[PDB]
Amino acid sequence: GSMLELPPVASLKGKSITSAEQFSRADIYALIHLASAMQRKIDAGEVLNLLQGRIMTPLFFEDSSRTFSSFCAAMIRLGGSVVNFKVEASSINKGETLADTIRTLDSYSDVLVMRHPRQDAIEEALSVAQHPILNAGNGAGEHPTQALLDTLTIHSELGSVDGITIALIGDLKMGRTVHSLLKLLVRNFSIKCVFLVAPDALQMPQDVLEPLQHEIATKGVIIHRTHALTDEVMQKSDVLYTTRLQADITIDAARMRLAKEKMIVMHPLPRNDELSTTVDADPRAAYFRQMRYGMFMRMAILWSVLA
Amino acid sequence: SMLELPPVASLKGKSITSAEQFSRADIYALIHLASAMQRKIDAGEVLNLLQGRIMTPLFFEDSSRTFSSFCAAMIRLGGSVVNFKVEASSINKGETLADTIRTLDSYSDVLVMRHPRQDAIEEALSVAQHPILNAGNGAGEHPTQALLDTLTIHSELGSVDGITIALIGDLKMGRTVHSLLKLLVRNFSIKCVFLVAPDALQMPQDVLEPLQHEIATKGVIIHRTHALTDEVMQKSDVLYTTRLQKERFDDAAALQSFAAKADITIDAARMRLAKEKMIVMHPLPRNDELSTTVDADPRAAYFRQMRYGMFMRMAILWSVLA
Amino acid sequence: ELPPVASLKGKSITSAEQFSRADIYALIHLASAMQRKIDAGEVLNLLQGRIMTPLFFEDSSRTFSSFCAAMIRLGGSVVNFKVEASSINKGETLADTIRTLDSYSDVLVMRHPRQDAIEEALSVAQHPILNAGNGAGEHPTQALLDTLTIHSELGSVDGITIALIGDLKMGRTVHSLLKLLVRNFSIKCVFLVAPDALQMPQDVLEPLQHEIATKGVIIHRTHALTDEVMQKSDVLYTTRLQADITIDAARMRLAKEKMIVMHPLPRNDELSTTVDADPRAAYFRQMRYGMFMRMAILWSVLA
Secondary structure (H helix, E strand, O other), rough: OOOOOOOOHHHHHHHHHOOOOHHHHHHHHHHHHHHHHHHHHHHOOOOOOOOOOEEEEEEOOOOHHHHHHHHHHHHHHHHHHHHOOOOOOHHHHHHOHHHHHHHHHHOOOOOEEEOOOOHHHHHHHHOOOOOOOEEEEEEEOOOHHHHHHHHHHHHHHHOOOOOEEEEEEOOOOHHHHHHHHHHHHHHOOOOEEEEEEEHHHOOOOHHHHHHHHHHHHHHOOEEEEEEEOOHHHHOOOOOEOOOOOOOOOOOOOOHHHHOOOOEEEEEEOOOOOOOOOHHOOOOOEEOOOOHHHHHHHHHHHHHHHHO | OOOOOOOOOHOOOOEOOHHHHHHHHHHHHHHHHHHHHHHHOOOOOOOOOOOOOOEEEEOOOOOOHHHHHHHHHHHOOOOEOOOOHHOOOOHHHHHOOOHHHHHHHHOEEEEEEEEEOOHHHHHHHHOOOOOEEEHHHHHHHHHHHHHHHHHHHHHEEEEEEEEOEEOOOOOOOOOOHHHHHHHHHHHOOOOOOEEOOHHHHHOOOOOOOOHHHHHHHHOEEEEOOOOOOHHHHHHHHEEEEOOOOOOHOOOOOHHHHHHOOOOOEEEEHHOOOOOOOOEEEOOOOOOEEHHHHOOOOOOOOOHHHHHHHHHHHHHHHHHHOO | OOOHHHHHHHOEEEOOOOOOOOHHHHHHHHHHHHHHHHOOOOOOOOOOOEEEEEEOOOOOOOHHHHHHHHHHHHHOHHHHHHHHHHHHHHHOOOOHHHHHHHHOOOEEEEEEEEOOOOHHHHHOOOOEEEEEEEEOOOOOHHHHHHHHHHHHHHHHOOOOOEEEEEEOOOHHHHHHHHHHHHHEEEOEEEEEEEOOOOOOOHHHHHHHHHHHHHHOEEEEEEEEOOOHHHHOEEEEEEEOOOOOOOOOOHHHHOOOOOOOOEOOOOOOEEOOOHOOOOOOOHHHHHHHHHHHHHHHHHHHHHH
């Protein structure tokens, strides 16, 4: 896509990303279009130099394969650079506080990408940092860029987000990904139906559902709770989005015989047994492609924040 | 550009081991270069001076500032970093330090080394062909900390000559204060140094004795205290404090440290006695010796200090590798 | 300039068996060309915007660092993935980990303690994988750089007498080197110097038996560095065991003038530091040849 422009999404300039709530529908589509243009240029072999001389520092206080690697790769493919700071090798072992660690990396960097097991640690970091912080996961709170890349996956695979029926399956209580995704979808799209598929003990929290209650009612979004992947959930869902425990909810090839032809199976990953390897060969299995869409969404995000 | 960012010629191709190796002219040249680096980077300019050159960090101790600032400085000059980790290396298979140095020296343009043995730097120099920069050698030295500390004093106060500085905390084990005292006394006309520490953690004789000539020649006043007395607070232009390395605490250091701890803590209450214009510095990391109540004070320079460190390390890397 | 070796384009590197003599010389000439340019201070931009991800499930100093340095010196970039800080801790399978890094990267460099792990990785990855060591199997790029070292230091590879010394049973470097040399060169003699319990495996020797016979390669086993091995060998290639076989200055008094000592490293006491100052000690130079061979390989794969 040599003649394609890469206009940054202006609303994101210089801003930290903490919640799916911060995005408008217009922002999301602008990011989607920007991510697709990124994908076309990169896949054609174009070299981008947009962020030369800019530094991202990862601040991962919990493990990560996709989010860490995707953000590093995205920065590099924009022409930016990464300082490979490791918490386990740092002055935190001599009692340095979180706030002083943030100030330290903020001294050298243009953007910080932070994942932390405490839900309020992001707000603490924002209180002392001069540069933008991107929330890569805050305890069982949110994972806002996962929601963005999930929505890019749905859009790219199915062609439309408005009108879908989506099942959110698994550990909904502790699942930061489904918290952000439900917020992003309900606030900004005309979703037909959401199945919330989980054991009662792991159901979607009231602190996610209640803020959405007014929009759910006014937009007429149907919310249906189940504790199993019933035939109804299988037959009606355009998207099955499943998650790992942080029940009769396993997705395997046998279960997929009930699914419609035009639908996708998604999973933020990593997975355990809830999503069988028997599904991997199915054209409807989108969870590996989902990871690559993440890299391009993170390119669109980084360029928009730092342009 | 040779107008804007001339390298400090004296540093070309040379290892940096000690604050002793620098002259006054070298230090001012680095200071002016670091200020030019800051100007350019803060204006958004992208530098390509070190494209194709590689720095490899070789950290055998933890670090937040020194590792990250060297990496960032290398990147901001257009160079690159090989992220070698000691814990994932052939050291686990019995590879010697010397062979490890030879290995990384095979691929790199500069090595940045921190090691818990004071003599490890010399051992590495004995086999490396490329420059090694000492990022801290046991309780010996931290020469680039001293350079960035001096940039900080110069930039914040306007002058290094004539200052009264208190060095506070674990002076015995503090590689940063060893290098800073050497750099300052050898190359500037310091008015007075307060050495503020429990007796067991005082500044070592191996640091003070070689400096006695410069101290006499320049008439530097040296006073030991075990407290931030009203006199230290009223007279100091720079309070440079450090963390007690309590993980090293025969029982005298622990007991004397505890006895002195409140007297050597800087907090908002103690700052009421400080000069209107002065700075508080700390190489970091800090623990409770430097209270968060001081962080909002304009005199708190220890966060700015870290950014000055990045620019000083750009000045250093560019001068070594130009 | 720097023409890539066309036969390597887009291919994974798994075994010394996959290379022809023409491939090896092309890689040697390209690596020497890159050395000339890099040593002259020239900056290469051949792989700007391309990413290598190292995936090391075993320790490494040379292979990891040399691959990263090689990628960087071609203008490429590295995503610094660590097994210990990854989702493997949450039960992620090797297959899924490969799929994950394959989503972001242009090339994966993989070392793993299981011999069959590289094949498993190949079965799911779309981008090339370079085998940086697969259990006690092979280490194909070590063999390539070893051969560059012999060429550059001695001038001919055909016609040499080479001793392979140490733990030949478990040594993936000697497995690959024996394959690469016997398949593609006319070697005069190989001394296999090892305790009986650690001798070169039959699963390495038997596939080579036809080549050995048709090229008339002499194969001798010893359990010690005898005077004959020391006097006749053009290359002493020694390895770490994971008295009779130690190389030190005393033993070097028996070596010919025109020979080299090599060691893939790391070493323990089997190669004394007393040898290090000898002009014949090539094992440090060998590491630098490795960086340039890896530049030649990465460029040829990704061109």
